[PDB]
Design a protein around this ligand. Sequence first.
Ligand SMILES: Nc1ncnc2c1ncn2[C@@H]1O[C@H](CSCC[C@H](N)C(=O)O)[C@@H](O)[C@H]1O
Ligand SMILES: [Zn+2]
Ligand SMILES: [Zn+2]
Ligand SMILES: [Zn+2]
Ligand SMILES: [Zn+2]
Ligand SMILES: [Zn+2]
Length: 1169
Amino acid sequence: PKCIQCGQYLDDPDLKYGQHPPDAVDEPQMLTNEKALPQHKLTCFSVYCKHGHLCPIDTGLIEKNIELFFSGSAKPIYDDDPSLEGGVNGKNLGPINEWWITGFDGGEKALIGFSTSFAEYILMDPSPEYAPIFGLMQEKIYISKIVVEFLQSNSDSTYEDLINKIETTVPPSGLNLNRFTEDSLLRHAQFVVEQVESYDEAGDSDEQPIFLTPCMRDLIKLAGVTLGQRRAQARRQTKATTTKLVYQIFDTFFAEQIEKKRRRCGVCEVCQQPECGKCKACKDMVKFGGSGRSKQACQERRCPNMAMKEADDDEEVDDNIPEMPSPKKMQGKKKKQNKNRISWVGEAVKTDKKSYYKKVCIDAETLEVGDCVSVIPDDSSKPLYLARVTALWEDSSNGQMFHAHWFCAGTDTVLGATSDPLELFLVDECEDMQLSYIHSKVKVIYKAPSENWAMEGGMDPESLLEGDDGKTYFYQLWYDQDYARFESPPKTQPTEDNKFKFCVSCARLAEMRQKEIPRVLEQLEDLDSRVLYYSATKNGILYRVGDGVYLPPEAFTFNIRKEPVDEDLYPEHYRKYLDAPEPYRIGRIKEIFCPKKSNGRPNETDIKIRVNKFYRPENTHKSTPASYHADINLLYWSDEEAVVDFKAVQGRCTVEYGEDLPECVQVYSMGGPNRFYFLEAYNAKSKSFEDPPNHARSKLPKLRTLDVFSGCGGLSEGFHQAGISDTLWAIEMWDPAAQAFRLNNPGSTVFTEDCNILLKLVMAGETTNSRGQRLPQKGDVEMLCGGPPCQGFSGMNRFNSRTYSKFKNSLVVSFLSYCDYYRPRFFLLENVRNFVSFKRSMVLKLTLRCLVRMGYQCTFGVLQAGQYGVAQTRRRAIILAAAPGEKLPLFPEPLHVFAPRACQLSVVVDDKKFVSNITRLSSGPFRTITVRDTMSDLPEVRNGASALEISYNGEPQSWFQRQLRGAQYQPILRDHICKDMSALVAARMRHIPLAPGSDWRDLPNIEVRLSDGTMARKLRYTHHDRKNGRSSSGALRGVCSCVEAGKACDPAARQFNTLIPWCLPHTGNRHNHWAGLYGRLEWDGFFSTTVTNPEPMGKQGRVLHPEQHRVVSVRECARSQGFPDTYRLFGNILDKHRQVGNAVPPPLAKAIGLEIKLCMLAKALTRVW
Ligand SMILES: Nc1ncnc2c1ncn2[C@@H]1O[C@H](CSCC[C@H](N)C(=O)O)[C@@H](O)[C@H]1O
Ligand SMILES: [Zn+2]
Ligand SMILES: [Zn+2]
Ligand SMILES: [Zn+2]
Ligand SMILES: [Zn+2]
Ligand SMILES: [Zn+2]
């Protein structure tokens, strides 16, 4: 039941009609007014339709040609008194043609003007009847103005950034509101976005339009905003500091790579407008009257709907193709060449199949062992093959032979076309081949690092350019195509017996094949059916009888519909319609044996293991809840036994009876990896515990580290816990983060500056900044680490001219210059997972290329945070790099078991699948850290908690909490504070049930008094949705007119300040029913991502507390990041929330740091000959 004129509903919610004294209608402009078009003022005004409903003038009625009329008292134009005293009462004025904003007073009420066919009217004060309608329009205009000005200040701001801006914006006195809310924005989303759109349409360019800002795109999706229409209201109207080498790399890539589906919706008004003819695009058209070269669409015709989809495609990884099998050995046939004569030189160096090794041979050229040759493949896409002659011999069965150690072309590596076309890489591929297949002799230069490589940073590459090159092939690094690892060549030296035969590739492939074969070592005892053994080796690990052993969870087993829903009360409940594997089985080796075959000899092709089962607390009849308090390190002895294949073993661990230990369990557990302990045995049949049987008994200096983009220091904290690092310098432009870093690092020098500033000063010769802080110089920095934000270069679509310039001077380039200048021993670049996929993987490739050019060993990999002791699903791209003379670290094996869908660590670059050294595929020794492990001990607080220092009011309840609280006597609970969500949002949280899986779809449709004094009225369902149907009671489920086929959204169907957010059923069908929004965290679950600013309808996943009616606290977020409770944060609550969220979790950083410690130990304790 709506009006035929205005779209308003005749019955309800709060309609209103007009009231006149009454007096005259338009054309009586004679009383005082008579004295291009005339202009007057109009106070105590009211707008209405032909049926007399008070209508807003900003919902498109006028432009749909529905005649809106108005009344009020007219005044002389020079009058400033709004008081009626004073004026001539008019009626049925209009209909309204244009309406526009004449400006703002002070302030800041917008001053609107009308225009009839007769005169123009500048409005003053509205009639008491029309006051609320005019107040909303007043609210629309101001909010839209704030948004536009906000989006101009930053093109990267997210949805939660936008809300914060709105909430901190003081509403003008004209409106009797004392605060704006998220609801205020969603209320006027359509109008605001239209203003946002019209900002761009006026000012045409090539840069991204202001409405494609992330926060706007989410708003257009959350609220159901229709894009592409109207713009009438107007009345006219960070650059990288680089070294020469780094600059040259990205500059040359530009010059050599500069030049270059979806279509317009065709339905939006932008698409239905003719080509203007005033823009550069239309001026460059053959049809009157340009060249027609640009072929760009009309500047006033770019479809915003098409723009959104292109923005969506740009954020997508296209794609994670299933298989994508494993990279094949670079294989096929070669061309037998037709050389004239092949003769040996000198005579046989060695004699052995009667193989006679020679030293030199003639092909009209001369070849020695160590020379390099070219070989022609019979060719598919194949280029020339290059190899090093490692041996020359004449077989008495085969012909004249040589062994070829293959080089790999740079373009065939992960580097791709970014590689120097003449750079080669050593490779684990070699082959016996006949001399007849040699095409030619070839010169390959080994470009070793100079002996002062550590000091050549920043130098003009023209100075080191000498002499006369590059004209031929060269190499400097070994390459592993499975792991994309660039490493220094093996320094392995041949015996005097090996000299003219030695092949490093053959040697490495030999050691590889030996370790991968499970082999029995020492025999122990001989029995009739089997032979016992003392030891055995597998994957380079020595297993002896009595050792602890990892086994897959399937190695052995232990001895062990609601009532119906009131769909009127819960009208959105109908929209509600793999796990982490078990941690390793742990056993102690009782026997190593092989069955004897028919002949009586032991069969050592299958090695067996008799093992004593160990019970985790979860394996006990007590089941899962036993793990809640138990150490993650704890086991129970058992007298149960099992026989497994030695093939099944996954590694060796230490399982020690706790009492026998020479030290504390805490010290023991913290002493090294794979350390378990037990105190009691467990009897399954009696389901009880008892003392175990007595046959169950038995240095480096820290690296001086510079942390760029340090933040509050999550990454540095982890490295410090690893014992490998002392962060003496930190660079952080954002003051609160830098301040927090100082608090946790008293001995560090923190520069609250832009990273581009410092390096420029150091490269200028300065020793201190203006504040007098001693700058780090060459030799000081031993390790460089940093996690630069990706906002400058974070698209998946390929580079273009404009977008590359932004990357050309990005912080990645800045950070690489720090690495080039200081030349640290180790280098780590942390970033988001998609860093590896940005710009069709060009950001990664250019980063690796830059490191290789500098002479660094390097690799990359993706790590899941949850696999290292944290209740959170977040992946990170990690680029590792090591100086020449160092060992390139491996990526740490997962310590904790975790859901496999969150453990997709593989990487696709140019249709080449890349993988890290990680062998534990979602498997592991320790159980998953849950939300319960994370925060179950923290005392109850409320929405808007602000008490910075409180008491824990209890003892730690989990291993996780025990470790993070520390060993303090009476510790203070810091920053257990949370955001003061608005009245409406607070009421919504209170009505989200505690049952796991609960979200907004569980909200009741009821009237409740909000804490701001207002009433949240029930959501009214107004239309029938044939995609969802009616409820079982026969009620409508549609909420807008856009739910029917081909219908536009209906204004006045909009509802706000409701418990169930109107915008969620409005756009639910297009976005998986917004599953997760207003969702609670599960005790058994995890954080969906790094929370930086917790919003229920935000983009950071579920952020409601599992039980308490509030959003998660800063401490709780810090707990999810594995921060020690004693770690200090700085600033206001949002400053602290962002600090924690931006941080690399210390448990992850520590795991990485430990792999680095190994390399430090290797270089210090291992020497080569
Ligand atoms: N141009 C610039 N110079 C120095 N720091 C910058 C910068 N631009 C951004 N940053 C800072 O770099 C940080 C990246 S997030 C910090 C990383 C995280 N705290 C960790 O533990 O590793 C942000 O806090 C940001 O303030
Ligand atoms: Zn009407
Ligand atoms: Zn369109
Ligand atoms: Zn045009
Ligand atoms: Zn070989
Ligand atoms: Zn709609």
